[PDB]
TrEMBL record:
<dbReference type="InterPro" id="IPR036514">
    <property type="entry name" value="SGNH_hydro_sf"/>
</dbReference>
<dbReference type="GO" id="GO:0016788">
    <property type="term" value="F:hydrolase activity, acting on ester bonds"/>
</dbReference>
<keyword id="KW-0378">Hydrolase</keyword>
<dbReference type="InterPro" id="IPR051058">
    <property type="entry name" value="GDSL_Est/Lipase"/>
</dbReference>
<dbReference type="Pfam" id="PF00657">
    <property type="entry name" value="Lipase_GDSL"/>
</dbReference>
<protein>
    <recommendedName>
        <fullName>Cellulose-binding GDSL lipase/acylhydrolase</fullName>
    </recommendedName>
</protein>
<dbReference type="InterPro" id="IPR001087">
    <property type="entry name" value="GDSL"/>
</dbReference>
<keyword id="KW-0732">Signal</keyword>
């Protein structure tokens, strides 16, 4: 009795899963590639840890996240594999509940972690108060496609403080500030959307995971988590928070997955 965990997002979630690669099974819950490959962490990422380390029962991971993704290239563009295209891949391959992924409302969890790149690319060129509702409304419409397919369990991660990644720190404190203030408005609107969607549907189980506050706690007191500082980069994924200048390592992702586990119990796999 597996939980089918369909995920959507950017490089903080990518594993390089192909819909034509080996598909998830009890003996191989990630499908492809092997657990620990394909990420920006030097090892498993939060999805690999949620699926294989923090799981309370069998979780099968279908991870459609793609590097650099924004929500929709008609709003903030970046790479072809935007969130809209990830939802289209889902609609093409998995939405109709094929024998390979025979999911139902009671055992499918749809996890979305998006917005890092929309904010990263639009924080100085757009008005957060009036532009972020457009991004959030497009996200909501994509979620509605899965709802129409019969999805009822949803996990949304808010945007973490990429303002304090080395890539942004290097641009100066006033840019860190401009980005952080825009990001705060995005995250508030995301929370409002998840709340409104949950109330209006009435038949959904949702979790909004506050990655922003969790990562911020670590950045503010890195030695309490065994990191020497909040700025160093180490591609071993464990010696520093940062695996490269814009992406945290496997140790951070494990800490996040462990923080998320109790919050995900209501979704069925944790």
């Amino acid at each position: 009795n597996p939980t089918y965990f369909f995920t959507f997002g950017d490089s903080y979630s990518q594993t390089g899963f192909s819909a034509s690669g080996t598909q998830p099974s009890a003996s191989n819950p990630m499908g492809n590639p092997d657990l620990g490959i394909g990420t920006t962490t030097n090892g498993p990422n939060w999805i690999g840890y949620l699926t294989t380390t923090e799981n309370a029962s069998l979780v099968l991971s279908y991870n459609l996240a793609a590097g650099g993704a924004t929500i929709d290239n008609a709003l903030v563009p970046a790479y072809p594999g935007d969130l809209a295209s990830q939802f289209r891949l889902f609609e093409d391959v998995y939405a109709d509940k094929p024998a390979s992924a025979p999911w139902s409302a009671e055992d499918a969890v749809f996890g979305v972690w998006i917005g890092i790149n929309d904010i990263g690319n639009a924080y100085y060129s757009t008005d957060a108060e009036t532009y972020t509702p457009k991004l959030i409304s497009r996200l909501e419409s994509l979620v509605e496609e899965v709802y129409k397919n019969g999805g009822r369990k949803f996990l949304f991660l808010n945007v973490p403080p990429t303002s304090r990644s080395p890539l942004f720190l290097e641009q100066g404190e006033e840019v860190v500030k401009q980005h952080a203030e825009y990001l705060s408005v995005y995250n508030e609107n995301l929370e409002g959307m998840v709340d409104d969607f949950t109330k209006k549907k009435g038949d959904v189980t949702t979790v909004l995971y506050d990655s922003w506050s969790f990562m911020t706690k670590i950045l503010d007191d890195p030695t309490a988590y065994g990191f020497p500082d909040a700025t160093c980069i180490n591609d071993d994924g464990t010696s520093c928070i940062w695996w490269n200048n814009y992406h945290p390592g496997m140790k951070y992702h494990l800490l996040q997955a462990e923080d998320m586990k109790p919050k995900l119990r209501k979704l069925g796999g944790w």
